[PDB]
């Protein structure tokens, strides 16, 4: 069809910030999440 695919992907996108410290030490931390930081 090549058109219903776009509708399906748009419906998926429409269907769907605090990070977490994954490690730390010596004054350096690594944090997961925060995609828009």
């Amino acid at each position: 069809s090549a058109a219903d695919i776009e509708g399906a992907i748009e419906d998926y996108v429409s269907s769907f910030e605090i990070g977490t410290v994954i490690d730390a030490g010596d004054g350096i931390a690594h944090v997961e999440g925060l995609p828009s930081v």
Binding site: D4, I5, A8, D11, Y12
Partner: protein, 50 residues
């Protein structure tokens, strides 16, 4: 055929390739987008979904 259309449609391939999103949702997206069409072999559709 599905491989060729996926190669020529990078956006759907990228969305389906990601593994962070729930698997059930991705399978449903593939069904309602590509492999749920009327004229599709059942076995090939099942293999692709798996």
């Amino acid at each position: 055929r599905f491989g060729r259309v996926l190669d020529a449609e990078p956006r759907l391939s990228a969305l389906l390739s990601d593994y962070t999103t729930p698997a059930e949702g991705r399978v449903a997206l593939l069904d309602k987008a590509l492999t749920g069409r009327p004229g599709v072999n059942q076995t090939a559709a099942a293999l692709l979904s798996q």
